[PDB]
């Protein structure tokens, strides 16, 4: 994973996102959704999803939330006050905590001013909570700004490392982007059965055709403009959509 003071930032983009494999994986110790309850994620579409990744203590997962304070949310990673995404977290004691301590994951604890939301600060200038220049070296009332979790495998819960991923769905002003999934059912030809062909909603009997579209045309229309043929997306065969039976 990535440190807590220099988190990562992956910009998930146009694809097919299935937040159900996440939501039901039962391996996550914390799955909170803020802008939007979790079950309705696989039914919405945004412009961009960002995923931020890092590693913190066990009892610091309550500062990854909109409107908190503490050494993590103050100056390591700040979430805006109208957050939209979801926060996921799971214990990782066996991977990150070795025998004797990892001392591989750092975390800033000495800053001048709290972070703006989603702001990042990887500098390493010597602090000076005193009242005298430092020139650039340790001493009294002026210290190095980074500390290290010394993770050990024999640590009580709440001191073992947790890995955190923060998904943030954003909606700028584009034309569209990623979105939930869309299962595909079967096709019963010959029987006035309601149908939906990737957007085309209708009713009627479906029948095997003998017309030939051009290999970019989806459905056919009549004079007076009514849909009368479609192409099945999966098998790519033309089917005549004759209106239902009436009189």
């Amino acid at each position, epitope marked *: 994973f990535a440190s807590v003071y220099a988190w990562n930032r992956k910009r998930i983009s146009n694809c097919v996102a299935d937040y159900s494999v996440l939501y039901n994986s039962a391996s996550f110790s914390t799955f909170k959704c803020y802008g939007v309850s979790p079950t309705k994620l696989n039914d919405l579409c945004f412009t961009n999803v960002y995923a931020d990744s890092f590693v913190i203590r066990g009892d610091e997962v309550r500062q990854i939330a909109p409107g908190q304070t503490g050494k993590i949310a103050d100056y390591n990673y700040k979430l805006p006050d109208d957050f939209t995404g979801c926060v996921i977290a799971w214990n990782s004691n066996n991977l990150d905590s070795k025998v004797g*301590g*990892n*001392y591989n994951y750092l975390y800033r604890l000495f800053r001048k001013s709290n972070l703006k939301p989603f702001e990042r600060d990887i500098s*390493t200038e010597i602090y000076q909570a005193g009242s005298t220049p430092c020139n650039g070296v*340790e*001493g*009294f*009332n002026c210290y*190095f700004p980074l500390q*290290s979790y010394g993770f050990q495998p024999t640590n009580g819960v709440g001191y073992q490392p947790y890995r955190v991923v923060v998904l943030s769905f954003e909606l700028l002003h584009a034309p569209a982007t990623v979105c939930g999934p869309k299962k595909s059912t079967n096709l019963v030809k010959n029987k006035c059965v309601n149908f939906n062909f990737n957007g085309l909603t209708g009713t009627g009997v479906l029948t095997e055709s003998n017309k030939k579209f051009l290999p970019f045309q989806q459905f056919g229309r009549d004079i007076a403009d009514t849909t009368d043929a479609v192409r099945d997306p999966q098998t790519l065969e033309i089917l005549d959509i004759t209106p239902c039976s009436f009189g």
Partner: antibody
Amino acid sequence: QVQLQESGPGLVKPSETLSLTCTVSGGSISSYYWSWIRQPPGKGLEWIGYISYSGSTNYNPSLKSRVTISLDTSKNQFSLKLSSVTAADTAVYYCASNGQYYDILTGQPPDYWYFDLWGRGTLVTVSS
Amino acid sequence: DIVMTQSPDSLAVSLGERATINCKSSQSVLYSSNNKNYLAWYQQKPGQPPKLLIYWASTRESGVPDRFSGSGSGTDFTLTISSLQAEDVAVYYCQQYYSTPLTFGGGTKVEIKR
């Protein structure tokens, strides 16, 4: 308490690089400042520099831009590189540290370097 | 930056006597705040790594006998032994620590006689 040991390249031809690794191997470590110190044969001690677990290097201004202390927290080893060796680098080199619990919430930084743990030393000479 | 000067560089102090050492400073210590001036004292036998004796200016730790005793404060420091012993022939250093450039003394040769 842990114990420390070194592994240099015995001799060294002039104007080469110098390779030394000091491997921590003990119980539960509690140190935060790993230092190398230097000693010419039958002369006075001299402090080279340290490295912290926060990656905060610090060097002695008589060997600046000749020393580089690294830190590998996947083997519990740290190391020192003297490039462009000279005839006046004939010394025994120790690695030493302080076995004391570390809290900046109670305590300034220059409280943790009086060199409690000590290595075993390895002779060296810019010979050839 | 800051240097200590160990004046008595050779001592022929036999058994049951006085064994004293001076080490001054080039600046001031004690950190004008609470307490606790910043010295240490190291014993080095030949063919050994040094061992430490004194934590802050006088206080010692488990492992050294109580016959090694530290004194002095401010900028003048002196370590006192227990009339010597059988195996005290060593070289002694007073390391300081005030900011970064950790400096050591010059050495001392606590001999004896026959």
